[PDB]
Write a protein that binds this ligand. Structure first.
Ligand code: FUC
Ligand code: FUC
Lengths: 310, 309
């Protein structure tokens, strides 16, 4: 039986699995009323990706496809799998892997490199890129059906029928009107249709315990706010667990957040089979801990184990 | 502790020199330039070199603060990516993550103010705009803690506020844009020697050439199909760093294998300093099944003769 391990990486060496951002802090929010059911950064401890999760850091909240027509200014674009193959709505996933998993106005850059080349230009293609926003709560956001819409400030310099890439950067806004809610899933097929093939919701099932998140702060195109995105495990853990494919020997692994300098355990946590952490903590907010710290697998325990309060 | 490479197809790898997926394996035997990139550099026993760091989000990124205005141009002091002051006495070429090629790098500058306003709900103000960093410019001196960027925006950039550069692609590859992926920036300006560089790499055996992981990089406008070639993908850097396996010799023999058929498609030398060579004599992509990946075979020496591709 290949033993279970986590990579040895401080918070400053980890990245968020739900948006292309570094991890900034560990965070808890015991009194959260929302169901936590994100679809990116989902991976079982034995290395099975779930939801819309894929392995590339560059694939998180990215889209690939072709603009079909103009419809600020608005544009419709077909979306393929990120590897360029046609997305097959019959595959057992919620949406193309990499699709954003939260409601909001996602701000980024749309770029295009034409397929046709010009002989006068050494047989090279024309290009354009422009800022763009994708509203994931809109009824035109239907990645599961192979089509989404984005808007631009630019009014004309976007070409139909040409290869198109969305590179995410941040959020456009977090004002009331922008519907930013990190725990509200998009309707991947539109509002009249149920989401399918989701990774399951996660929650603590032990008194005194709460979810522990890896939190990143996300840039804003304008306006006021300090929005955050919380993931259940960083992208490097997803990648590592996928590589190792270690059998889970129980439903719950005991992990310790250790200070390598002093060799001391700062706190302990449960790492659950479906790929998320809980701690025994009675407050909300960031965890204040030495920047050299990281989680180390200790042993397999079970649902009856009582964590020492942080 | 036995040496390993991660098991990842090209479609599961990313470029260590720009935040892009790997598109193809590629050779260019007749390259006249010295290959001495500073990102994606890691020895086989897991020592990062040049300006290499572990975060995919850190590649060609900058953090710091705008100081003044001067297309509109802006001066920006840069810190380490973790926010701490960059110490020019540290033994690196420049802050880790700094771009390692000449060109006009296109991306977005974003800002989140330090001060908050009660009227506005005790939340800080924000702004982001397209920006371009010309790494060949005399104003590009990251080793001295200071760079310059330009924007189409003419005014909506604030001084003295935390600033982030998120790279997206190149602004142009026409002649006046000086894109040369193998020409290093002068991290302190042209009249100064770059220091603490990861070493140049080359085949030391007749009939061999470097093998690259190639990505195509987006363009803001104009014509071109520019590419960035890295010596090893970011995932290999991350994996080698984790395992810290001793290099038993100076050259590890690796085999590109088709997992379905078990067949070896070709073999390569993975050198101690962190790069591949193959026995091949033409420029262009390597044509190989999408399920293929490199697997560590054994250790050998500089004189081992590779099966021609
Ligand atoms: C509060 C304001 O928000 C947006 O309009 C920004 O572009 C401004 O610079 C300012 O930060
Ligand atoms: C060849 C041209 O290059 C730039 O001017 C782009 O903005 C145009 O859309 C076109 O691609």
């Amino acid at each position: 039986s290949k033993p279970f391990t986590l990579p040895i990486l401080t918070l400053g060496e980890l990245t968020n699995s739900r948006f292309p951002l570094p991890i900034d802090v560990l965070y808890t929010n015991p009194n959260e009323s929302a169901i936590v059911q994100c679809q990116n950064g989902r991976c079982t401890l034995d290395g099975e990706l779930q939801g819309t999760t894929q392995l590339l850091p560059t694939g998180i909240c990215a889209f690939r496809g072709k603009v079909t027509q103009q419809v600020g200014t608005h544009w419709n674009m077909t979306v393929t799998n990120l590897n360029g193959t046609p997305f097959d709505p019959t595959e057992d996933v919620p949406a193309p892997l990499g699709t954003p998993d939260f409601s909001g106005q996602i701000y980024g850059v749309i770029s295009q490199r034409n397929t046709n080349t010009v002989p006068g230009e050494g047989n090279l293609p024309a290009n354009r890129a422009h800022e763009a926003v994708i509203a994931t709560y809109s009824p035109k956001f239907t990645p599961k059906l192979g089509n989404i819409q984005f808007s631009t400030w630019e009014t004309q310099d976007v070409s139909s029928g040409q290869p198109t890439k969305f590179t995410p950067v941040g959020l456009a806004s977090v004002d009331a009107n922008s519907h930013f809610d990190q725990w509200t899933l998009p309707s991947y097929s539109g509002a009249l249709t149920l989401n399918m093939n989701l990774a399951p919701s996660v929650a603590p099932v032990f008194p005194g315990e709460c979810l522990l998140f890896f939190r990143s702060f996300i840039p804003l195109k304008g306006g006021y706010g300090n929005p955050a995105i919380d993931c259940l495990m960083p992208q490097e853990w997803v990648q590592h667990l996928y590589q190792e494919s270690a059998p889970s020997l129980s439903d719950v692994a005991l992990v310790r957040y250790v200070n390598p300098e002093t060799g001391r355990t700062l706190f302990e946590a449960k790492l659950h089979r479906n790929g998320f952490l809980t701690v025994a903590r009675n407050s909300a907010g960031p965890v204040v801990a030495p920047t050299n710290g990281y989680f180390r697998f200790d042993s397999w325990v079970n649902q009856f184990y009582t964590l020492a309060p942080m």
